[PDB]
Design a protein around this ligand. Sequence first.
Ligand SMILES: Nc1nc2c(ncn2[C@@H]2O[C@H](COP(=O)(O)OP(=O)(O)O)[C@@H](O)[C@H]2O)c(=O)[nH]1
Ligand code: ALF
Ligand SMILES: [K+]
Ligand SMILES: [Mg+2]
Length: 307
Amino acid sequence: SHMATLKVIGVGGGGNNAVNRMIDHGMNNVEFIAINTDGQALNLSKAESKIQIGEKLTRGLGAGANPEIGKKAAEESREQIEDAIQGADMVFVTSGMGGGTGTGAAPVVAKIAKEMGALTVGVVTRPFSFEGRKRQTQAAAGVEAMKAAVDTLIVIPNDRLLDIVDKSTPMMEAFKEADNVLRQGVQGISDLIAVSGEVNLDFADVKTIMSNQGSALMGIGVSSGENRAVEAAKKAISSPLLETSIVGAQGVLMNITGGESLSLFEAQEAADIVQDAADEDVNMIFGTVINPELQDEIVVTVIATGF
Ligand SMILES: Nc1nc2c(ncn2[C@@H]2O[C@H](COP(=O)(O)OP(=O)(O)O)[C@@H](O)[C@H]2O)c(=O)[nH]1
Ligand code: ALF
Ligand SMILES: [K+]
Ligand SMILES: [Mg+2]
């Protein structure tokens, strides 16, 4: 009866990089929108829907690290952005904070999406420390503006990427690990909506956990074998890339997908892992999906808010 529409909007270079890499990986039922001041970069976007903002302000160049230019560019293109969003039930805005276009335009895009009725989720990066204190301060202002504009916000500090590489890991491989946060979160919600569960969660439950909540965690864990449920739940909540850990979470949406072997005992174990790591009394919205195609695999998806 309700087919929820999910859109992913990349704003500025980093955001559109993430969109491009997600399209390459392959997403389905999700619509992509690319927004940038930089017309050269936008010509290379793989997104179906492309919005060049601020052409008169920038002559098709970027914003030159000036967020006021990105903000004014987005505000002047409000009607085009509205038209591209219209009909979305959920919008993910992804951007790299610290530059001019993402920093300034992404909070405007998020504000428009929320004013258009969409549940609005931001997934943004903070710059590497080696980019310097000015970039970090500009980024921090962007994060605060994002938080004011979205329903929920996931911040990925790029410094955390330095914790998951070895001395030879290619930069692009590291960047794909940061992309997975957004990609797997979107996929988890898409799967929740598309698939009827035995204990069934719906898009209204996503809205209840995410609407007007501030910081968020979105995680997926997959495991097989002995202790799979605990192992998958620990993976869902323990990403090394997040600014907002699970600790302090007051509300959680947790969905467990398994085959016909999914036991009640292991569902409780998984729920307990999440409750205990939060170190809070967590208001949980718990779901389960029986996918008989799965054999020994179990998948735990977690959305945590209420920090
Ligand atoms: N993780 C990640 N961070 C990025 C990527 N591209 C840019 N960044 C970060 O995003 C910040 C903003 O750069 P960019 O998005 O290109 O600037 P803009 O086009 O003016 O918004 C940079 O300072 C980097 O910290 C990317 O592909 N992945
Ligand atoms: F690419 Al920009 F400010 F638009 F760094
Ligand atoms: K469902
Ligand atoms: Mg750029």
